[PDB]
Structure formats: C-alpha cells, structure tokens
Amino acid sequence: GQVPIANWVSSATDWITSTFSSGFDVIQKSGTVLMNGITGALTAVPFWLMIAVVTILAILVSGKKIAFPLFTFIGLSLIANQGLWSDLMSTITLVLLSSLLSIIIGVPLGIWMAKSDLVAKIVQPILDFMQTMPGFVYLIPAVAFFGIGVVPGVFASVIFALPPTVRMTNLGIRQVSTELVEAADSFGSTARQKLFKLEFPLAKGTIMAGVNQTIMLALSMVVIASMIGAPGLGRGVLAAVQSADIGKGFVSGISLVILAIIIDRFTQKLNVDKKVDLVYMNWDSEVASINVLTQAMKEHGFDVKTTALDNAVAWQTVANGQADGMVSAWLPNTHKTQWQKYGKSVDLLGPNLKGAKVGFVVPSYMNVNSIEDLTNQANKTITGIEPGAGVMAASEKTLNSYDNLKDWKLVPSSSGAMTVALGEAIKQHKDIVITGWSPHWMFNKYDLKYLADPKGTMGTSENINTIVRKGLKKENPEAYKVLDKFNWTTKDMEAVMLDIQNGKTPEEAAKNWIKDHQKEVDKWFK
Amino acid sequence: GQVPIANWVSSATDWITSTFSSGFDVIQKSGTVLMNGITGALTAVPFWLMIAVVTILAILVSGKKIAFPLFTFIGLSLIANQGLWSDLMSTITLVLLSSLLSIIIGVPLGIWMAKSDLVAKIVQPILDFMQTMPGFVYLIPAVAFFGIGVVPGVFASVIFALPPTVRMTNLGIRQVSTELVEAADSFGSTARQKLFKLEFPLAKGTIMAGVNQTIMLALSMVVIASMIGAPGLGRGVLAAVQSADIGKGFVSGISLVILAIIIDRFTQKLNV
Amino acid sequence: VKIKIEHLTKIFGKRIKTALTMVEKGEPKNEILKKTGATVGVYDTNFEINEGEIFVIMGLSGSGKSTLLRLLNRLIEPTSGKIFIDNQDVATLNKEDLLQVRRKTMSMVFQNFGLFPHRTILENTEYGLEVQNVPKEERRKRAEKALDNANLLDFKDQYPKQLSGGMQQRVGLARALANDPEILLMDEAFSALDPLIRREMQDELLELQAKFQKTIIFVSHDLNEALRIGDRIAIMKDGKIMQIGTGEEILTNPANDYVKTFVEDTAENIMIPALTTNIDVDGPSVALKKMKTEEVSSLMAVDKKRQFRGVVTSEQAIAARKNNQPLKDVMTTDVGTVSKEMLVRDILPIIYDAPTPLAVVDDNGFLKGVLIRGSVLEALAD
Amino acid sequence: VKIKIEHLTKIFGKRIKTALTMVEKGEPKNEILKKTGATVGVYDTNFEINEGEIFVIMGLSGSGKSTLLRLLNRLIEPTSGKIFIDNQDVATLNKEDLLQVRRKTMSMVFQNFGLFPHRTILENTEYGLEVQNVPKEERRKRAEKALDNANLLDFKDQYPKQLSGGMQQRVGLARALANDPEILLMDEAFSALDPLIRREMQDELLELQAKFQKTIIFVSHDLNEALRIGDRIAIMKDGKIMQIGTGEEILTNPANDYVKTFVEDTAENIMIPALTTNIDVDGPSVALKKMKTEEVSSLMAVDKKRQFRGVVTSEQAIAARKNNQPLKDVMTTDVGTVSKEMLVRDILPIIYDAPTPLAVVDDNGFLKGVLIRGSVLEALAD
Ligand SMILES: Nc1ncnc2c1ncn2[C@@H]1O[C@@H]2COP(=O)(O)O[C@H]3[C@@H](O)[C@H](n4cnc5c(N)ncnc54)O[C@@H]3COP(=O)(O)O[C@H]2[C@H]1O
Ligand SMILES: Nc1ncnc2c1ncn2[C@@H]1O[C@H](COP(=O)(O)OP(=O)(O)NP(=O)(O)O)[C@@H](O)[C@H]1O
Ligand SMILES: Nc1ncnc2c1ncn2[C@@H]1O[C@H](COP(=O)(O)OP(=O)(O)NP(=O)(O)O)[C@@H](O)[C@H]1O
C-alpha cells in the first residue's frame, strides 16, 4: 500500500512553521530591511562611478592584458544602457548574502568534517542528496518559512550553494601531505596552530574553487527564485520566458553572464505613508491591469511594490498577511480551489471587470464548433498553460467529465508559450487545441473561436475580482478605498495589450490609455 | 541612448525559424515519435522486473558492498509506490537523448580544441558564455524552433550540458605527458594511432567525469524544461512549486535525486 | 639510560582487544590477521636506550619500524605498553604534558624532509618555537644560529622548492635542533638524498653527535647506513629479532637465521664492477680524469671491442702525457688474468705479489670484474 | 659518414624571420632575445656523424641540446637547415616519408623512460611495430626476443609502475631496438637511474654497440657519462663551442675558455671523502663488511670522538677475527699524516713508500680526507 510521504512532510513543515514562526518572522523583518538598505546604498552610487571603480579594480588585478577590464566596462555600460541597474544591484546583494552565509556555514562544516571520520559519513550522503536535488524544491519551504521576498532567495541560494564549498574544504584539508601534519604534531602544534599555519595556507586553492562554485550556484538559484520575491534580473528573464519574449530574456541572460564572468575572473585572480504592495502573475491580461493600476495609482501619491509570482503563491501571500492585495482573482470557478484553500483568509472587495470569458480556443477555419464534436484532432493534445493555473482545475475536470476526452492529453506550458506554438500552427495551418481565456490579444491578430461547452463546468459566470488581507481597511484605507473602486471597461483594455504586442513598453502603453481615460481613472482614486 | 538588442535578437530568431522551418518540423516529428516510442518501451516493462534488473546491475558493479544496491531497490520501490514510474521513464529518455547528443557533438569538439590552439581560443569564451547563462533562456528559442513538447527539452539540455564534456575532453587530452606523446610521434604514429592508443585510454577518467557533469546538467535542464512539455517528475515538482504543495514537490525531488545518485554511482564505476 | 619500554605494541584494523589478548599469549601475526583482519605492525617490543646511544632500527618495508618511532613520540597512540622517559611515562599522559614533552625533549625528522613549502626556510626552522609562544627575535636568532651551523644561512629568505635534497634535510635537522631536544627521531631521513650526500650527512651527523651528546632513534633499511653510525642496532620483522647491537653481535652471534640473510654474511662471484679505459679512442688525459672522478690510482684497459688488454697506472699516463706518447705502448699487458669461477683460491699466492687486482677476464677475452683483497676475506673463512 | 647538417637552427617565440635573418649575420642570442623576445635554442649548428660513432652532446640545462635531437627526428620542425640521411634530406620531406624514416631508421629514448602505463611491457615493446601494421606473432616474437636480450622476459605481462628504473630503461631501449633502427637518440636516458645502475647500463650499451654497429646520438650533462662511452663529443652552449671529440681534444686543445671550466681541468683540496672505522664500537667483522661494501682492501680508523687514530688492513682484521683480538691493538698507528693545505708537494717522497694514502688530518686530530696518487697528477702538471 502507498505510504503518506507527502502528508508526513507537509505535517512536519506545518508543525515547524507553527512552532518557530516568531524566529522566522523576525528574521524576515531584519533580513528584508537589511537587503533593502544595502540595495538602496548600492543604487545610490551612480552607475558611472561604480562602473569606473570596477574597471579600475580590473586594471589593478591585471594590468598587462586589456581584455578583462575592457569586457567589464563594455558590459556594465551595456547593462546600464538597457536600464538593468537597480535589478543588478538587488541581484548582487542577494548573491553576497547567499555566498557569505554559505561560506560561514560550510567552511566550519568542512572543518568538523575533516577533523572527524564520523561526520564525513553522516554528511557526504546529505551533500549528495543536496547537490543533485533540483532548485525548485528548495524554495517551496522557503515561502512556507519566510514567505515572499529576498529572504527566500537567500535561503535557497544558501542551501543550494553550500555543498561544493563544504566538499572542497573537506577535500583540501584531508589532502595535505601527511609528513607536514606529522611534523606539526612532532613540534607540539595544537589543532588551532596547525589549522591556521599549515592546513589553510595550503588548502586555500581548493577552498577558493569551492567558493567560486558556491557563488555560481547562488547566482543560478537567485535567477530561479525570481518566481518568488527574489528581485533582480531573474524577474526579467522569468517574464521573458513566461511571455516568450526573446529579446528581454536574451538581455537579462547576457547581463547575468557579464556579472558571473566578472565575479569568476575576479575570484581566480584572488586565489594566489501611502504605500501599496501588489501581486500579479505575468499573464498578459494581468500585466495590463496592475501596470496601468500602478502608473495611475502613483499619481495620487501611492508608493508601489509589484511582485510577480505564481497564482497559488499569491493567494497565500495575500492570505497570511504578507501583502496588500491583488486584482487577478478570476472567479467563481477558474480559481475556486484557490478560494477553497485561502478564500477564507481575505476580505474580498468586489468585481473589477465584468465578462471574463473562459474556454478552449481553436482556429476558426477548423471544423469542430464544440468540445463534444472533437474526435482525434491535433494529436489529441490540449496545449495549455502553467500547471498551477486555474483552468487546469477545469481542464483536469473537463477531460474527466466527457467521454471523447477520456483519451486526450493535457500538456502544460507557459501563458505565452502556447501563443507562439499557436502561431506556428496557423502558419503551418494545422489543427491545434489550446487552453485559453479572454480578454486577450491573439484574438485581435488571428481568426480563432471558442468551443461551446454543453456542461459549462470550465466557466460560465466568470468575472475578475480583487482580494485584500483582512483588516487592511484598518492599516491602509487609502488603497482599500482606491482598490474598491477599481472597476473598468472590458472592451479596449486590449489597447494596453495590443499596443504592447506591437512593440511598445508595458508602462508606455499603460501611460497612453490613462490619458485617454483619465476621467475614469480619477474615479478609482476616490 | 539605448541600443536595440531586443529587436536584433527577435528579428534573427524570426528569420532563422521561418527559414529552416521544414527542417525543424521534421526534427520535431522524428524526435517526438522516437521519444514516445522509447517511453512506451521502457514503461511496457513491468516495474518489478526493471527494479530487480537494476539492483542486479548494482550488485554486479559492486559485489561486496550491499548499501548501494539496497538503496537502489528501496528508492525505486518507493517511486513505483508513489506512482512516478512513467514520468520517470520519460525523464530517463530525455536524459539519454540529451547526454548522447552532447557527448557526440562535444567529444569530437574537445579533440579539435586540443589539436588546435586557435579553436580553444574561439570556444573557451563560448563555453564560458554557455555554462553561465541560466537554463531558463535556452528553451525560449527551443519553443520558437521546435515548439511545445520534448524536442525543445532535449535541445536545451544539450546546449546546457555540452560545455563540461567539451572542456574535460580538451583538458584531459592536453595534459598527457609530452614524453609519451613524443614517444608516439617518434615511432611514427599518426594522429589516429596515438589518439586511439595513447590519448583516449589516459583521458578516459577526465572524459567520463565531464560526462557525469553533462548528465547532471541535462537532468537539471529537463526538470526546468518541465515548464514546457518536457514530461516526467519535473512537471510534478513544478506543480508543487506553483501550488506550494511541499508534498509532491519533495516526493519528485526525492525521486530525481535517487535517479541522479544511481547515475552518478554507475558512471563512477565505468572509469576506475 | 634514558628510555625504557615494556610490551609496547600497536594493532591496526578493528576488533582488536582479541588481538591484544592474543599477543598477550604469543600467537603469530599472520594467524591474527587471518582470524581478525587486524594487521599488526609492532608486537611485544621490549628494550631500552641510553644517552648519546644512536640506536638504529633496521628492517624491511612492512616491519612496522617507523610506527615504533611515531609511538615513541605518540603521534600514533600505543595500543598498550609504557615508555619511561625522564622517569615519566608517555602513554598515560594528558594532552598538555605530552605536548610539552614533544616541544622540549623530542623532535622528529622525516624521509621527504617534512617541510612547509608555503614558508621560507627560516620560518620552517623556527616553527618549533613559534608554536611555543616565544618572542620573535630570539626565535630568529636561534634559527640563524642553527642555519649558520649548517653553512646555508645565506640561503634563508628562500623557499625549499628551489633547493636540493641535502639542504632541505639540513634545514629539517636544524628545525629539530633549534628546540635543543634531548632526542632526535628519524624516519629514513637520508634515504631520499644521493649516496654521496648521504655519506656527507652521516659524517656531519656523527660530528654533531660528538659535539652534542643527545640520543638518536635512527631508522634505515641500509645496513651500511647503520654500521657506519649505529652504536646499537635493532632489527625488526614485525618484532624484535635481536638488538644486542654493538655492531658485530648482529654479525658474530646472530640469534636467528633471518638476520644472517638480512646482513648477507665460494667462487669468484665476489668480482666487482671494473674501471675501464678504452685505449683506442681515449688517451692519457681522459684516463687521468677517470682516475680523479673514480678516486683511484690505476685502471683496466680494454680494446675498442671490449676485449681486455691490460692495466694502466697514473704514472704511466703522466709519462704518456708529457712524452705525448699514447696508450697501448706505455701499458701493462702482463697481468694475473683470471676466469669467472675457476680460480677461486689457487690464486692466493699471485694476489700478494701484484698490488693491482686480477681481472676476471672471460675466456673469450671479455671482462666482468676484478678482485681486490676480497679473496683474503673468504680464503681465511675456512 | 651517415648524417650531415647545415646551418640547422631553431627559433621559438614569435616574429622570428627577423631572428632568422639575424643569425644569418651572426648576432648573439641575448641580443635577439632582448630585441624580439624570440628565445633561441639552437644557433647555426654544422657538423657530421659517422656509423657506429656514439656522438655525445653535452651542455647545461638551457643549451638547447635535446632540442637538437628532436630536430634530427623532426619532432620539432626545424626553422632552417638540412639533414642529409641516406642521401635524403629530412626537413623537406612530406609526412608519409618522414613517418617511414621514423619507423625504420630512427628511434628514441627518453629521460623518464617514455612508457605507457596503460599497457604491459610487451605491448610497449612492440608498439613500434604495432604502429607499422604488421602481424602480431612476429611482433610478439621480436618483443620477447629483445626482452630476452635484456634478461627480463619473465617480467613481461606486468606493468611498468611495478618495476624499477633500470628495467623500465631496458624496456624503452628494447622498444627502440625492436625496430632494428640504424640510429638511437637519447635524452639523458640514464640520468634518472642510480649511478650504479647507470654504470651497468653504460657497460651494457657499449656491449650492445660492439655487437650492433649503429649510430647513437647520446645526450648527457655528466662529462663522465660521455668520456666513458663517447667516441666523439660535442659541447653546446646555445651553439657548438667545439666537437672535435676523440675525448682529449676537449681536454687537450679546448678552443674556448668556457669548456675548460665545464670539464674543470694547488693545495690539498684534492683530498677525497675517507672510509672510516670507529674502532671503539665497531670491530673486525664490521670493518671487513665495510671493505666489502666499499670495494677496497684497507680503511682509516678513528677514535669514537672522530679523532684520527691510524689505519687498518684486511689481513689485520682477519687476524683479529680469528684470534678474537680486537682493533686498536692489531692496527697501524704509524702513518704519513698530513695537514689540510700545508704539505702540497713536499710529500712527493713519502707517498711512494706507503701503498696506503696519507690522511689529511686536521691539526687538532680531526680527519677530512685522504690522498691516493692524485698528488702525482698535479706534481707533474708543472
Ligand atoms: N676513499 C678511498 N678510495 C680509494 N682507496 C681508498 C680510500 N680510502 C682508503 N683507501 C685505500 O687506499 C688504497 C688506494 O688504492 P690505489 O689507488 O693505490 O690502488 C687501487 C686501484 O689502483 C685499483 N682499484 C681499486 N678499486 C678498483 C676497482 N673497483 N676497479 C679497478 N681497479 C681498482 O687497485 C688498487 C687496489 O687498491 P686497494 O683497495 O687495495 O687499496 C686502496 C684502499 O684500500
Ligand atoms: N596506515 C598504517 N600506517 C602505519 N603502519 C601501518 C599502517 N597500516 C598497517 N601498518 C602496519 O605497519 C607496517 C608498516 O611497515 P613499515 O616498516 O613502517 O613500512 P614503511 O612505512 O614503508 N617504513 P619506512 O620507509 O621506514 O617509513 C605494515 O606492514 C603493517 O603491519
Ligand atoms: N618550449 C621549449 N621547448 C624546448 N626548448 C625550448 C622551449 N622554449 C625555449 N627553448 C629553448 O631551448 C632551451 C632548452 O635547453 P635544453 O638544454 O634542451 O634544456 P632541457 O630540456 O633541460 N635539456 P634535457 O635535460 O637534456 O632534456 C631553452 O634554454 C631555450 O633556449
């Protein structure tokens, strides 16, 4: 019979988070304020100054070759040209905290590893279980422990970057020639004396190699954690992924490459008020809303913090009390299970947009007019979106509600991955079924249609709402008043989304609509 | 004063994908059918049989020791209990395609790098630019070229796992003592003779170590690609992440680490 | 007397109390291994050492002799036994007292010189004091003093890697001496040097020990390296075969039969490699150079084709040089030539008249070796 | 004659045609380096070699002498010059012809034995044929034949790592010989062995060359290792100082002044390390063992405290052994004792009467060395 591993792990994590909650919360406060202060300090430094400083350090470290300093200056100038500075500074602060904590917690661990033969046996298994574990796991408990922000990035980077440092430390202390140790013992060198006189000054090469690996791992894990808090270039590349935006993804990847090469090359050359905290989910529908919301909401004098992450996390984020609110809550069916979990831990306001039409989507030219009239078109696939989405609750139930779909497959993707896959299909002019919703922009470029749902489970009376943590009316009424009024047209929202897909910036397109409808916008501010 | 990197890259991607479209489509068809066939083959086999076979291989490669085969049997039984078997086979076939493609196209490139100092100068920069980019990026063109599914997963895994293979190959052929090389060239041994008699059998340790690294990278990139097609336990862990359901996430991570441990131990015992 | 040992022994492996009990009865080592898998390196060792008594410890790789040293210094904790130094045991000491004993009395020397490459010679030399928490000027004073005693102070402020084996060994020995130890343990110290430098170091060590009367637990696998310097030897094959020492009693009354093959106590197999001079191509000056390098006064002369031809002498070569006359004319063809194992002792008379040896020329004219009063040794062994 | 070379030279670094032009006029190497940064290892080398003519190539680390070898075999492509072997140049050859020349005529030997550890000795030995695409039984036949010529065939089907330097060198030399080459290039082959094994290998090589008349381009930094075997020497300091060879012309008419210090052509600094016998602790049997190991017939005898005491002889020790009477009684205190640099030549008479040498005893009784007819050498240098 099956064993309840999942239940055991969840129960243990719940018991922890209910037990050490105060320590986690105080760590959250201290760490977030610390990292924010460091980032403000670093970005207070103008880009030209810090770029020149780093190029000077490059020159000092190597004065003969002009390759590294040149690459450094050119790349950093390029980054700051693209506008990716503040994000870069957040990335650096995350990486510094991660690397320092990993070193501070690993090198001592390498000591207690090498000086004992039991501890190696205990830990090496743990190191192998940590060093192949995927990064995605490490940031699940992080949210469960500290919640959204920079703290999760730091914690995940710590736990994912510790292994190589510890391993290489234990290797470099266990590999010094036995004659030297035997001598240092023959002269009566206490463990401290030999450790600070013989072990380290010889193992430093391996230790620094392990530290370089630790830094690489922390950097990659920050990029990954971008899905939860973890500001910086990770958010940019993640959004480029969840929207298939090749240009921005390439830009953020090249900037991370520049940062990582800089840090690497350095390492091998040092061996010898009215505020609002909002949440959204990178969906072209919800990018339009919040971005427009923030740009306008700023005008009244509101301090903004938008946080892009996944749907169910946001509900938890808004639920436990870690954020103000969010306007991306499709309801009462697409995101209902989310409500069954954390619908009780909010204070719902009311709709913000009438007419949220959910359903499948197929090219108009194709014959099928309803899902019941589907035999085996498109390799029996359902090219959908991220598995944590809400329609996947519907689609999972859809395939398990009708007969003809009993042998059809659901294949998740991103909310923008299918759109390019769709465009490939229409250019290829092949039948293809895709999970979909409205409002959306591809309807304005292609000739597509929904499929009538005779059972209507996947959504009939659908309408976006917005939620806010309980008692926020007593802690930030200005946004509570503003958010309550946030309800606007269904029809030409799309200008926000059609303009962007044509080649404009989200804020630039979000600005333009507000000028057209400033009168309606000011209604929200009341 | 901004420079249009985004526009240049998007235009190049659109041109390349609209120009070689037939080749990408045929590759998509062949790869998807091949991978579905491989997965059906590997899941047709009853799970008790395959667990027993693999535990037998563990005992074979390690005869006196019992801990490693015991761990193999226990972990695979745990997987099959939780139901993550077909997912596991899909993950394996992705890993195999990625690893073999990376080896096939890298090891020769390692030879070439070791044979010419110019190619090393050209490539080492490219390897640094390749092993340093996050995996997230590598798949965006994959979809643009191959579309949703598995083909993009293996392409991205190839691109993310080829560096250490190439690097270790070049390093392990460049570090052989020049005395043996001079002996080989002094008895009249062409490049093939010394390459298949002297260079390889002495570089094999480095090469297989790098090919262990390659496999780890391909496995991680598959887990990442699970966000696009790329079936397996990556989908389970991704769903756990997008839902905070630590249960399924930890289960799938346990299964992946079990697989990676098995592969690391096996590869560790093909070089000694 | 300085040291005194009692039933000292060391057992490796696991499940060893059984092995300790076994050696407490007298079971051989091999039975212990086959039964428990607990290899033993020392076995019921009992002896004593005096002051100034260089006490060599011979044996073969596997005798567990260096282990005995490291047990004396307790780098390897003894499985059992006692070590009475200064009327103070050593296997029952807390950490700090053992530590002070190491800092003051004992001191160590290693095969591969045990030197820190990440330091300059003086720092290595003073390490023994550096670890004793003493002010630095006296440290540097004693370091430079010891180096000056070894004629390499100018080679300080440098790194070992840029030196040769001999100077590294001198540095290690000085590092040992800086402490003013009453003892000096060595683990095949001179075994990594060239035999020439080995002899030079042996002579220097004897000079030192004459000046400095301190005990020395030497170790070597070369019986020469022990007879030269050793005042009392102890041979080891997993245990003490015999240590009567005094140099001959290993040679005169060897208790065992193994020692008699270890020290290796008829026919002309006693021939030795010869010193040759190929006259047809070489000449007087070359021959004299060979004599100088080879530290002799005469030589054997052959034909280009390795046929023996005769003998040459320093005066003959000098006359050839001054006269410009070449070899093969001023040369000694007449010689008491001999065959390989065919004139064992009938040669007793002839060897006396001729100061030069008697080449054991192959019957076909080839040469294998010579004989230099090694015949008188076993002619009288009868 | 076999080989003939013309203006052969090799330039490293970059921007070298300028350096080639420079050497075409005669600019020194150091100017070339400082001006271009193109270090040069060979410089306008011209000479010739005959058949059976072991042609040593001496020099110091930095003379670019091994580079000359590798140029002969073309492992390092010559910057310029020609090499007429078999009336066939070698620097203007396509790949296949050079390859066959390497397989047939030439063959190589290295300092660290150039052996493949991932093979067993026989495979290494037959590699030279294995690469020639020949059937395997004749390969194995010739391999076993060559090994039998080196008295280690029983040591086949084993790995080099489990052997000692001498056998590895013999294996490398056999691998070279299996081909039946007309030439044998060596790069300090015997420099990694023990000097004893070095002499043994030199003698064996001379034996071989007597049996096998094939050219040998030897290389060594030991002048002894060249005079012993070398039929024509060539000294190298970035260029050919002189190669008149024939052994003495390097000694008799050295063109340069550098050679005269390279070969190193008054006071009693000629004293040599002595052979000592500390009578107070050692005795007759030990003394005879020392004589046997040291390959002599007499010894010098001191006091425990390193004071000189006199001399001992093999017969004296034998009488002591048979009589059981110890040293210091049957001993030769009377001796022509001498001081360190104070009896340079007045000693000429006394050295003649006494067959034994004259210890250069320090005025305080200490001993430094002895003198064995090395005095006759520079007494007549006048
Ligand atoms: N460090 C040292 N190096 C050399 N000799 C030392 C010495 N310390 C003390 N002696 C004594 O001095 C004598 C010098 O030998 P000489 O050169 O007169 O005359 C030598 C030499 O001319 C020749 N010879 C000695 N060893 C030889 C060898 N291995 N091969 C060929 N000829 C040899 O035969 C004679 C035999 O001399 P033997 O041994 O009866 O006598 C030797 C030796 O007993
Ligand atoms: N790890 C170990 N260290 C030391 N001795 C050991 C060890 N394991 C087993 N022994 C025992 O000690 C013996 C070592 O022999 P020994 O003569 O000390 O060799 P060695 O180290 O080659 N000597 P030396 O060259 O003077 O340093 C082995 O034969 C074992 O019986
Ligand atoms: N990479 C190189 N390989 C060989 N020779 C070089 C190289 N670079 C420069 N040279 C030149 O060749 C010289 C080498 O001197 P050489 O006497 O061959 O030294 P070695 O290699 O220590 N000799 P050996 O011990 O007989 O192998 C240098 O001093 C340079 O002038």
Q: Is the distance from CB of C159 to CB of C117 less than 8 angstroms?
A: yes
Question: Cα A117 to chain center, whole Å?
Answer: 40
Q: At what angle do helices D165-178 and D121-130 cross, to 10 degrees?
A: 20
Whether the CA torsion A140, A141, A146, A147 is positive or negative: it is positive
Sign of the dihedral through C-alpha A249, A251, A255, A257: positive
The answer to whether the CB of C294 is under 6 A from ligand 1 is no
Of all protein residues, the one whose alpha carbon is nearest to atom 8 of ligand 3 is D12
Partner D contacted by B187 (CB < 8 A)? yes
Judging by DSSP bridges, how do beta strands C298-302 and C183-186 pair with one another?
A: unpaired
Residue C39: CB atoms within 10 A of its CB come to: 16
- Distance, CA of A57 to CA of C247 (rounded, Å): 68
CA distance C113 to C170: 9
C270 lines ligand 1 (CB under 6 A): no
Three-state secondary structure call for residue A392: helix
Q: How many CB atoms lie within 10 A of CB D44?
A: 15
Distance from CA of B164 to the nearest CA of D (A): 25
Q: Quick one: which of A360, A387, A389, A358 has its CA closest to A373?
A: A360
Q: Which residue of D has its CA nearest to C378?
A: D318
Task: Enter the tokens of residue A249.
Answer: 């993804």
Tokens of B199: 């260079």
- Domains in chain C, please, with CATH? 3-263 (3.40.50.300), 276-380 (3.10.580.10)
Q: Let me know: does C337 contact C359? Beta carbons within 8 Å.
A: yes
Structure tokens given for C351: 């060897």
> Which of D66, D94, D112, D118 has the most B C-beta neighbours within 10 Å, making it the best mutation to test the interface with B?
D118
The answer to whether the annotation marks A335 as part of a ligand binding site is yes
The count of other CB atoms within 10 Å of the CB of residue C26 is 8
DSSP result, C176-195: HHHT--SEEEESSGGGGS-H
Q: Which phi and psi (to 5°) does residue D57 adopt? A: -135, 100
In whole angstroms, give the CA distance from residue D312 to residue D333. Answer: 9
Chains D and C touch (3+ CB pairs under 8 A): yes
The answer to whether residue A198 neighbours chain C at the CB level (below 8 Å) is: yes
Q: Which residue has the tokens 């599914």?
A: B149
Q: Chain-centre distance of CA B188, in angstroms?
A: 38
> Per DSSP, what are the bridge partners of residue C29?
none
Among the bound ligands, the one closest to the CA of C112:
2
Q: Do chains B and D touch (3 or more CB pairs under 8 A)?
A: yes
* CB contact (8 A) between residue C127 and residue A186: no
User: Distance from CA of residue A249 to its chain's centroid?
Assistant: 14
Contacts of D227 (CB under 8 A, 6+ apart): C282, C286, C289, C290, D233, D247
- Tell whether A178 is within 8 A of chain C (Cβ): no
- Residue A237 and residue A219 in contact, taking contact as beta carbons nearer than 8 Å: no
Asked if the Cβ–Cβ distance from D99 to B193 is below 8 Å, we say no
User: Which residue's alpha carbon is at the smallest distance from atom 39 of ligand 1?
Assistant: D296
Rounded Cα distance between C11 and A32, Å, is 57
Distance CA C219, CA C56 (A): 5
Strand order in the sheet with D276-278: D276-278, D298-302, D308-313
Cβ atoms of D108 and D114 closer than 8 Å: yes
The answer to whether the CB of C376 is under 6 A from ligand 1 is: no
Interface of A with B in 374-403 (CB under 8 A): 383, 386-389
Give the Cα separation of A356 and A423 in Å (integer): 23
Residue D337 three-state SS: coil
Sequence-ordered strand ranges (E) for A297-449: 303-308, 325-331, 353-354, 358-363, 381-383, 409-411, 434-437, 448-449
DSSP assignment of C53-103, as one string? Answer: --B--EE-TTS--HHHHHHHTTSS--SEEEE-BTTB-STT--HHHHHHHHH
Q: How far is the centre of ligand 2, averaged over its atoms, from the C-alpha of A182 (Å)?
A: 15
Q: How far is C188 from chain A (nearest CA, A)?
A: 13
Which pairing describes strands D360-361 and D367-369: parallel, antiparallel, or unpaired? antiparallel
Residue C182 amino acid letter: E
What is the spatial order of strands in the sheet that A409-411 belongs to? A409-411, A381-383, A434-437, A358-363, A448-449
The whole-angstrom separation of Cα A109 and Cα A120 is 10
Contact yes or no for A368/A377 (Cβ under 8 A): yes
Taking the alpha carbons of C363, C366, C372, C375 in that order, is the dihedral positive or negative?
A: negative
Which atom in ligand 3 lies closest to the alpha carbon of residue D220? 26
> Are the CB atoms for A361 and A448 separated by under 8 Å?
yes
Please answer whether residues A435 and A383 qualify as being in contact, where contact means their C-beta atoms are separated by less than 8 angstroms. Answer: yes
Is A263 within 8 Å of A215 (Cβ atoms)? Answer: yes
Per DSSP, D145 falls in state H
Q: Say which ligand is closest to the CA of D75.
A: 3
Separation between Cα atoms, residue A101 and residue D137, nearest integer Å: 66
Say if residue A152 is preceded by a cis peptide, omega within 30 of 0.
no
Calculate how far, in angstroms, residue C60's C-alpha sits from the geometric centre of ligand 2. Answer: 10
- Are C320 and C327 within 8 A, CB to CB? yes
Resolution (A): 3.5
CB A394 within 8 A of CB A463: no
Q: From the CA of C357, give the closest atom in ligand 1.
A: 34
Distance from CA of B246 to the nearest CA of A (A): 6
Contact B249/A136, CB-based, under 8 Å? yes
CA distance B135 to chain D (A): 39
- Rounded CA-CA distance D41/D29 in Å is 9
Q: Are A456 and A468 within 8 A, CB to CB?
A: no
End-to-end Cα spacing for chain A: 60
Check whether A423 is labelled as a binding-site residue: no
Q: Give the residue whose CA is nearest to atom 25 of ligand 3.
A: D61
Q: Where are the alpha helices (DSSP H) in A45-150?
A: 47-61, 67-82, 86-114, 117-131, 135-145
Contact residues on chain B for A260, CB-CB shorter than 8 A = 132
Cα–Cα distance between C202 and C213 in angstroms, integer?
16
Domain locations along chain B: 5-44+83-268
Q: Are D219 and D233 in contact (CB under 8 A)?
A: no
> Whose alpha carbon is nearest atom 26 of ligand 3?
D66
Other C-beta atoms closer than 10 Å to the C-beta of A407 total: 9
Pair of tokens at residue A416:
């923008």
Taking residue D349's Cβ as centre, other Cβ atoms within 10 Å add up to 8
Residues in chain B: 272
Q: How many helices (H) and strands (E) does chain A have?
A: 22, 10
Whole-number Å distance between alpha carbons of C118 and C134 = 21
Query: How does A132-147 read in b/e, with b if 16+ C-beta sit within 10 Å?
Result: bbbbbbbbbbbbbbbb
The half-sphere exposure of C319 on its side-chain side, counting CA atoms within 13 A, is 10
The CATH number given to B5-44+83-268 is 1.10.3720.10
- State the burial class of residue A233 (Cβ atoms within 10 Å of its Cβ: 0-12, 13-18, 19+): buried
Which residues line ligand 2 at a C-beta cut-off of 6 Å? C 12, 39-41, 59, 61-67, 187-188, 219
Q: What are the DSSP calls for A198-248, one per residue? A: IIHHHHHHHHHHHHHHHHHHHHHHHHHHTTSS--SHHHHHHHHHHTT-HHH
Of all protein residues, the one whose alpha carbon is nearest to atom 40 of ligand 1 is: D297
Contact state of A140 with B240 under an 8 Å Cβ cutoff = yes
| Contact residues on chain C for A184, CB-CB shorter than 8 A | 127, 131
Three-class secondary structure of residue A497 per DSSP: helix
C-alpha C315/C-alpha D380 separation (Å) is 9
The ligand placed nearest to the CA atom of residue C222 is 2
Written as six digits, the tokens of C140 are 């540097």
Q: Does A191 touch chain C (CB under 8 A)?
A: no
Cβ contact, residue pair A246, B132, below 8 Å: no
- Ligand of minimum distance to the alpha carbon of D317: 1
The DSSP element (H or E) to which D240 belongs, if any, is strand D240-242
CA distance D295 to C272: 7
Residue nearest to atom 13 of ligand 1 (CA): D356
User: Is D376–C318 a contact, with Cβ atoms under 8 angstroms apart?
Assistant: yes
d(CA B239, CA B255): 15
Whole-angstrom distance, CA of residue A334 vs CA of residue A464: 10
Question: B146 and B25 in contact (C-beta within 8 Å)?
Answer: no
Q: Which of B248, B240, B236 is nearest to A227 (CA)?
A: B240
Do the beta carbons of residue A243 and residue B5 sit within 8 Å?
no
Nearest CA in chain D to C285: D248
Q: What contacts A117, CB < 8 A, 6 or more positions away?
A: none
Experimental method: cryo-EM
Which chain C residues touch A if contact means CB-CB below 8 Å? 70, 73, 75, 99-100, 102-103, 106-108, 110-118, 127-128, 130-132, 175, 179, 185
Q: Which amino acid is at D335?
A: V
- If you compute the radius of gyration of chain B from its CA atoms, what whole number of angstroms results? 21
Diameter of chain A by CA atoms?
A: 90
Name the token pair of C107. 């001191």
Query: A357-450 belongs to which CATH class?
Result: alpha beta
A388 is known to lie in a ligand binding site: no
Q: Are D146 and D181 in contact (CB under 8 A)?
A: no
With b for 16 or more beta-carbon neighbours within 10 A and e for fewer, the A309-347 pattern comes to bbbbbbbbbbbeebbbbbbbbbbebbbbebbeebbeebe
* Chain C residues in contact with A179 (beta carbon < 8 A): 110-114
Nearest-CA distance D315 → chain C (Å): 7
Q: What tokens were used for A173?
A: 């202390």
